[PDB]
Amino acid sequence: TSDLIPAPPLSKVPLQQNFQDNQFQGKWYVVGLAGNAILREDKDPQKMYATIYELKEDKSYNVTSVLFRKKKCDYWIRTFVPGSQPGEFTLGNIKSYPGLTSYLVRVVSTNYNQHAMVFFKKVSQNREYFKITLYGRTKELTSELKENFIRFSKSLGLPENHIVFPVPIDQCIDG
């Protein structure tokens, strides 16, 4: 069993206007992370990881996540397929993920060369999960951007213990 804070309606999740897919490319650090299955752990805090976006000829993204785990760099590859509006995506090859029936990505805000906020919603084993990432082009962002991210996370119904700021590291994510 399992008890989750409900996903917000999509009406509460803004979309970046005039989204520019070419400018969103490249490496983003995960400076903030919040969601209904994200929990602060002071015993063993979340380490920063990175996500690299590469725009393919057909305008899908190849999306590679890089995490430092058990002394090694762990890589995860996904495809984001353009959805109903620019800045919105669904997951490619969804059938290769057991239990997954739905996956949605919406770029909420970005200035492309410093920060972004991205919303994800998925249905897995019939459970609805959502998260929000605060991306930085660098490993640090201003207090202002972080407090905005906190405000936005709370507006989607998340309490403070479901909002995490991964600790900067140098392994793997400096690629």
Binding marks (x or -) toward ligand TC2, 105..134, rule CB under 6 A? ---------------x-x------xxx---
| Shortest Å, Cβ 127 to ligand TC2 | 9
| Shortest Å, Cβ 100 to ligand TC2 | 9
What DSSP designation does 167 have?
A: B
Residue 28's nearest CA partner among 42, 48, 6 is 48
Three-state secondary structure call for residue 164: strand
Q: Which is nearer to ligand TC2, 56 or 127 (CB)?
A: 127
49 assigned binding-site residue? yes
Taking CB under 6 A as the rule, does residue 162 contact ligand TC2?
A: no
The one among 37, 45, 59, 161 contacting ligand TC2 by CB under 6 A: 37
Stretch that binds ligand TC2, among 29-37, 56-64, 93-101, 146-154 (CB under 6 A): 29-37
Three-state secondary structure call for residue 148: helix
- Which residues, at least 6 apart from 79, have a Cβ–Cβ distance to it below 8 Å? 60, 61, 62, 63, 91, 92, 93
122 assigned binding-site residue? yes
7 assigned binding-site residue? no
- Which residues, at least 6 apart from 135, have a Cβ–Cβ distance to it below 8 Å? 28, 29, 30, 31, 51, 110, 115, 116, 117, 118
Interacting residues with ligand TC2 (CB under 6 A): 33, 35, 37-38, 120, 122, 129-131
Binding region for enterobactin = 103, 131
